Paper text:
The MPD molecules were bound to the primed site region. The peptide LLKVAL was cleaved and bound to non-primed sites only when co-crystallized, whereas soaking yielded binding in the primed binding area. Of these, 26 bound to the active site in a substrate-like manner and several of them with a different binding geometry in each molecule in the asymmetric unit. Peptides from patterns I and IV bound to cathepsin V consistent with the observed protein cleavage sites, whereas the peptides from patterns II and III did not bind according to their cleavage site found in proteins.
Addressing the elusive specificity of cysteine cathepsins, which in contrast to caspases and trypsin-like proteases lack strict specificity determining P1 pocket, calls for innovative approaches. Hence, we set out to determine the crystal structures of cathepsin complexes with representative peptides of cleaved substrates. As a working model, cathepsin V was chosen because of the resolution of diffracting crystals (up to 1.3 Å) and crystal packing with accessible active site cleft. Reactive site mutants C25A and C25S of cathepsin V were used in structural studies.
Numbering used by the authors:
A (entry chain PA): 444 to 447
B (entry chain AA): 1 to 222
The structure:
Amino acid sequence: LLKV
Amino acid sequence: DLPKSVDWRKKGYVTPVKNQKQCGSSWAFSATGALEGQMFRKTGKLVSLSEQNLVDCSRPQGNQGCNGGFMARAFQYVKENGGLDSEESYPYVAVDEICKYRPENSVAQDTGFTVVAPGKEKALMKAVATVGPISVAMDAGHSSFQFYKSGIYFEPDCSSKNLDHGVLVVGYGFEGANSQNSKYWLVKNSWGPEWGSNGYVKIAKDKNNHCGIATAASYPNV
Ligand SMILES: [Cl-]
């Protein structure tokens, strides 16, 4: 998952 | 029996926290983190490994670069490929690029990988205590995780089955005086040193496989  | 706590960072097995930036490559950081620790156990030298080599070259093994992948498929690529380049020789740029693997720059190898029994937190504890850092997948899809800062992470909405992020368990421990109370897994993320606790997160341990940390764990065989 990407950091937002 | 197993130690009451383990922290491989204190023994030189773990590189400084990295940052995958805006690319779905946590699986690559989790895999290089586990191979970094196994190569250190084998040779005594800590060498940062190339996530970009995995992003660009492991499509044949079923990874999709910046669109996702799995650590076991990465260890499968390193075995089939015969090697993996250093971070220095094959730098991370966070976008899918042409494969430029160079055998002469390889600094790691593996013969395949070992799987931890799915869902078994005590099997995972034994792997962490006797092998070194272990690649794991987790459910990180929550604002509580994005904004995590300290303490034992416990999110009620966490899944132990539908996981979406690869991370690295570098140890485990407990808060307080009772080694069985408030246990946690020590986890290295790839969102930079600035995220969480110097880039790490304590995830609740022996609390029904919280966030799925023991659902899909594995480590390379060197
Ligand atoms: Cl990702």
